[PDB]
Write an enzyme that holds these catalytic residues in place. Structure first.
Site, PDB file in Angstrom:
ATOM      1  N   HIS A 230       0.831  -1.204   0.000  1.00 25.58           N
ATOM      2  CA  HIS A 230       0.000   0.000   0.000  1.00 25.58           C
ATOM      3  C   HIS A 230       0.868   1.258   0.000  1.00 25.58           C
ATOM      4  CE1 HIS A 230       0.927   1.284   4.103  1.00 25.58           C
ATOM      5  NE2 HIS A 230       0.829   0.012   4.460  1.00 25.58           N
TER       6      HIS A 230
ATOM      7  N   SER B  12       3.789   4.047  11.574  1.00 25.02           N
ATOM      8  CA  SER B  12       2.364   3.741  11.707  1.00 25.02           C
ATOM      9  C   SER B  12       2.130   2.359  12.336  1.00 25.02           C
ATOM     10  CB  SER B  12       1.672   3.858  10.340  1.00 25.02           C
ATOM     11  OG  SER B  12       2.364   3.108   9.344  1.00 25.02           O
TER      12      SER B  12
ATOM     13  N   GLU C  68       1.632  -4.924   9.201  1.00 26.33           N
ATOM     14  CA  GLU C  68       2.865  -4.162   9.309  1.00 26.33           C
ATOM     15  C   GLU C  68       3.599  -4.538  10.600  1.00 26.33           C
ATOM     16  OE1 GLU C  68       5.516  -2.847   8.267  1.00 26.33           O
ATOM     17  OE2 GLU C  68       4.694  -1.048   7.324  1.00 26.33           O
TER      18      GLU C  68
ATOM     19  N   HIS D  81       5.046  -4.164  14.173  1.00 27.12           N
ATOM     20  CA  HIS D  81       4.590  -3.416  15.349  1.00 27.12           C
ATOM     21  C   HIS D  81       5.775  -2.644  15.911  1.00 27.12           C
ATOM     22  CE1 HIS D  81       2.925  -2.255  19.154  1.00 27.12           C
ATOM     23  NE2 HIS D  81       1.879  -3.062  19.089  1.00 27.12           N
TER      24      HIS D  81
ATOM     25  N   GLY E 188       5.055  -3.053   3.970  1.00 25.18           N
ATOM     26  CA  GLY E 188       6.489  -3.168   3.685  1.00 25.18           C
ATOM     27  C   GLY E 188       7.154  -4.352   4.365  1.00 25.18           C
TER      28      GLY E 188
END
Ligand code: Q9L
Ligand code: CL
Lengths: 240, 237
Positions: free
Chosen positions: B9, B21, B87, B89, B185
């Protein structure tokens, strides 16, 4: 009650604007039908509804309704199951014709017969129909058997292939305690409502579920409704 | 030769992709949405067909997938979501920008975290503004106490992504199902490192581009037969 079930019928499609029979044709929501879905989702959000699993058809007007609702209630992460068994009724050779072309080709007597009948299908979608390959050859139905892929459906046929999915895949989830949301079409949801309420053929054919409006069932542990279906929304929307 | 497509994304709201994020459920920005649209357009132009899609439980990835399915007219495809494709953490760093991270922890420690495969950031503690937002989120309620992270090294992220790849995705690929994966990613790093047998240092320098279909052709043992390629117009490629 032990259990809570929510249904939502998708709103206006591109072909509703053309008064053309869609059926299994995969028409998208019109901008207004998309707005309808957003208002239904806002109604669910304002009432604090939470789901654990979602079911929908393989038609994008229902799928996009579901997506819009999930976005509105911040539950985009929920599992979603799609099935051809929740598809709209297959209108056979009427698919793609508008109101005028239907009356011109078939006459008002024959059209009234089809309109009022529970079990008389419209003509079959033949291989020379302009949407025959578009629908019958779509790879999304590649796993259906010959007897499963309809050329046309009466309402009885539609309900007959929706209810196996209800019984085999949805009922177990409800009795597992999962809070179910179903986003689908007028005639497949008719099949579910007829089963839930034990309605007659006459009663189910006069039932017109409103579009874009969450339909709430409170169910006991045997999945019998404990009260009439309820519509969520502001006062004006509910009245209409 | 099996075909596998990955997509990472694009940009999230409030500059959160530059603010660790992590597990915070940031939405796409309008620009990240547009990125997803261009990626789906590339797949449509190339005539790609899928049979099953995998994504995380984070809305920026889910919305990327939705945008792609819309562009390629394949909204009917089965979709499977899993926290195991989330993603990385980022623990207590989640939500902080670069300057705030350096001010709180010092440049020395930040460099160590940046360069390390196996050192996690500090845990997200109850005073963190995202602590209850993430750790009590209903979507993680079935996770055991050992599964729900308070922080992750890159090694940790890859370790919990790869069981999903092995148990759920690989059998689909081996049945001939054409798989699309929309994720993040660092979870996609886990997949790429397993596919290409990369070293820790190599995977740690690999920065997959965003919003661009990433195409793998795998042999019968799911080994890439060639390097990963990107779909799009010539300049973006
Ligand atoms: O007049 C009615 O209310 C009516 C209602 C139902 C039916 C009907 C139902 C099932 C069968 Cl198998 C055959 C006919 C026919 C009707 N009469 S109709 O003049 O031919 C017509 C035909 C298409 C539409 C239409 C189509 C798509 C989107 C919006 C409107 C609207 C009206
Ligand atoms: Cl979905």
């Amino acid at each position: 009650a032990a259990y809570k079930l929510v249904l939502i019928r998708h709103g206006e499609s591109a072909w509703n604007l053309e008064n053309r029979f869609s059926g299994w044709y995969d028409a998208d929501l019109s901008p207004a039908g998309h707005e309808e879905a957003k208002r239904g989702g806002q109604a669910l959000r304002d009432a604090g509804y939470e789901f654990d699993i979602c079911f929908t058809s393989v038609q994008k007007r229902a799928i996009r309704t579901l997506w819009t609702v999930l976005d509105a209630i911040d539950q985009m992460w929920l599992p979603v199951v799609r099935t051809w068994r929740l598809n709209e009724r297959h209108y056979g050779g009427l698919t793609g014709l508008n109101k005028a072309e239907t009356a011109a080709k078939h006459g008002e007597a024959q059209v009234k017969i089809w309109r009022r009948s529970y079990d008389v299908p419209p003509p079959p979608m033949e291989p020379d129909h302009p949407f025959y390959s578009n629908i019958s050859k779509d790879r999304r139905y590649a796993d259906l058997t010959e007897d499963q892929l309809p050329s046309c459906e009466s309402l009885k046929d539609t309900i007959a292939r929706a209810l196996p999915f209800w019984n085999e895949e949805i009922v177990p989830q409800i009795k597992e305690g999962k809070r179910v949301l179903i986003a689908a079409h007028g005639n497949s949801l008719r099949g579910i409502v007829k089963h839930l309420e034990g309605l007659s053929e006459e009663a189910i054919m006069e039932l017109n579920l409103p579009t874009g409006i969450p339909i709430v069932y409170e169910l006991d542990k045997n999945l019998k409704p404990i009260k009439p279906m309820q519509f969520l929304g502001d006062e004006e929307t509910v009245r209409k």
